Amino acid sequence: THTLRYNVRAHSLEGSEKTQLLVLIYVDEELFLKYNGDSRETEPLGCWICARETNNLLKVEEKLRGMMAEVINTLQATLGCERGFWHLGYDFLTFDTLTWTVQNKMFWKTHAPRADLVKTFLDDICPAHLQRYLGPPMVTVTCRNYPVGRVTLTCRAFNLYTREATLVWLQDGKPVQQKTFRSETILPSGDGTYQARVSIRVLPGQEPQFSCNLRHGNHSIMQTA
Amino acid sequence: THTLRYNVRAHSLEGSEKTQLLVLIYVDEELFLKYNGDSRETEPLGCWIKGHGGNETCARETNNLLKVEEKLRGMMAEVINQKSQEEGLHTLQATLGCELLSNGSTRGFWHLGYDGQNFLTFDQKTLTWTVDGPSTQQNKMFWKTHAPRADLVKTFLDDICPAHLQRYLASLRNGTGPPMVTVTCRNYPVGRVTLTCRAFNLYTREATLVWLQDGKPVQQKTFRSETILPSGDGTYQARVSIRVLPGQEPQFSCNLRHGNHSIMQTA
Amino acid sequence: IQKTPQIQVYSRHPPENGKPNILNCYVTQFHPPHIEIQMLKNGKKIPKVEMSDMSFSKDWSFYILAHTEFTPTETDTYACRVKHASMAEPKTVYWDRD
Amino acid sequence: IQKTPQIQVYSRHPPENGKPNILNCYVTQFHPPHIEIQMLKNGKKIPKVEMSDMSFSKDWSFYILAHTEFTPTETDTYACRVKHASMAEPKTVYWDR
């Protein structure tokens, strides 16, 4: 349910022609950390939400670089957590059983990263990294005597830390309508947080029976009309 | 909000009468009028304006410009005379004008430059000249008295320049196409691909270009009056490049912001 | 092939007349990636409008967030006007507080 | 006291082989104002080069735009060559893409 993914490519630095890894780190499928040792006018250390992280980033680059020293000597690789995975190549090789799945077999099997060091990284060291990487919302309700013969109730949730949310209209505690928000339906507030909105029409006089419930993470928040 | 700016430069410091001046007039950072008193110039006057009656407007406003050059010469006569005494070749510059604020009020300014460095600055609040560089008290007092008379300066900046700007803005109102973006690739240097994003047909000198990798900015540049590239036809352009590894190009997109436009192109 | 932009206009924080706030114009699901966005107060153009970087969605479409500082009142109207090649005419969406 | 010119060379329009265009040579941030600018085609000086008035920016440094008509081809090379008291030797900047 949570995914850490390293995307790495061998490359040489302009000055001394030794090899480093350009690494891209994706937590939950979004670009999170970046180390480009051969940057020129761009930043070698990239982070989007740190400094503590970028310090570890340099360390995981060498760790990964060391593990793949033999095959480094256009090599690219993608690896990560959640179950682990590790693929290699000049794009063909996969860490299946603690062995590597591809004359081609003889060369790859020999040069491949040690299965011991690989299993440990995927089983313990990488989950820890993913673990390391990993006020309240507020709800308002407004009412309008509109349209004719109806009252419109509008529930808005502000200050959502993530883009997942459920808003429920309840009538005397009975769920009436529900909306679960996705990506492309959740609203960016523009300050890093997200917001959502559901509305409902009721008969005049029904309003005091109605309440709005926000479920977000471990938050369950009530607001009456 | 609008700005009128006079960029003035003496060609060579002879004296208050014989010193020839280049005067360039900018409205909202766009070159509008020119007077060049250089004897070796075949076209001493210039006028950049479009639309109907443009030629008549140039006739009027280049003639008006001649009067402005007279006033500027007069006000700066003593500074010119004193600097003309200096041995060797030196450069006297001035920038001055006024800014119309959206609340209808006016902010004036007047700076002098000497040999490419800040020289004097007119203090709007104080109504006196400030010596900008390191300076003895003797030299400060000296220039405070030989710089353009404060009452003349203030009338020009508070009354005359704003009236000119207003007259210019009316003649300009007679105001195309959208901006465009291109992306090119080159296998350079040796083990890299240089991605170059260019924005063309910018109507003003304000724009931002950003290279994006998976939605995240990897290179960003904001272009302004003095960093944006003149295309030469009255429109502007901009450029940002990055180096990536071969095969990475699909990951990168260039996003232009200009005025109300946002345009993105993927490599 | 072209997709018509959806436009949503809303305040960053719960609105209160006389209290400084941010008005968002969230423009989604359009294609091609060329949009023109204007924000209006009482029918007149707002000078300073911020735009986020344009983003790509998985449904093969683009989106962007524009916004401007504002102080809501009872009588002032606000709107977002959008031009895009998928539309013959500019589309205007008024801020509705509810 | 002396400021070295920055030299940028670029087409007015997106370049296409065989199509008439304009090559700009934008020289900025220099002082003193005296400068020599030449535009080159295959190493040789291009006779008709237009030049803007030399203006200056907020920090007083000077700028000027030189340009010439050209039709880009696959084999023709273009450059801008600039001489200024701030530099020992003439600086040459080639056009690319």
Numbering used by the authors:
A (entry chain C): 6 to 54, 63 to 86, 96 to 104, 112 to 120, 124 to 128, 131 to 136, 143 to 174, 185 to 275
B (entry chain A): 6 to 180, 184 to 275
C (entry chain D): 1 to 98
D (entry chain B): 1 to 97
Study authors write:
In this study, we present the crystal structure of mouse MILL2 at 2.15 Å resolution. The domain structures of MILL2 are similar to those of MHC-I molecules which typically associate with β2m. Instead of typical immunological roles, MILLs were reported to be involved in nutrient metabolism and wound healing in mice. Notably, an unusual basic patch on the α3 domain of MILL2 bestows HS binding capacity.
Unexpectedly, two different conformations of MILL2 were observed in the asymmetric crystal unit. One conformation is essentially similar to typical MHC-I molecules, whereas, in the other, the α1-α2 domains are located distantly from the α3-β2m domains exposing the interface between the α1-α2 and α3-β2m domains. MILL2 is the first β2m-associated MHC-I molecule shown to form both open and closed conformations. In particular, the α1-α2 domains of H-2Db form 108 interactions but the corresponding domains of MILL2 form only 97. These results demonstrate that although MILL2 associates with β2m by the same interface, the molecular packing between MILL2 and β2m is less tight than that of classical MHC-I. On the other hand, the tight proximity of the two helices formed by the α1-α2 domains leaves too little space to bind ligand. By contrast, the interhelical space of MILL2 is filled with amino acid side chains from both helices. Interestingly, electrostatic analysis also revealed another large basic patch located on the exposed surface of the α3 domain in both closed and open conformations. This region is composed of Arg194, Arg200, Lys229, Arg232, Arg247 and Arg251. In the crystal structure of MILL2, a SO4 ion from the crystallization buffer is located on the edge of the unique basic patch in the α3 domain, proximal to Arg251. Interestingly, binding to heparin by the basic patch on MILL2 released β2m, indicating that heparin-bound MILL2 adopts the open conformation.
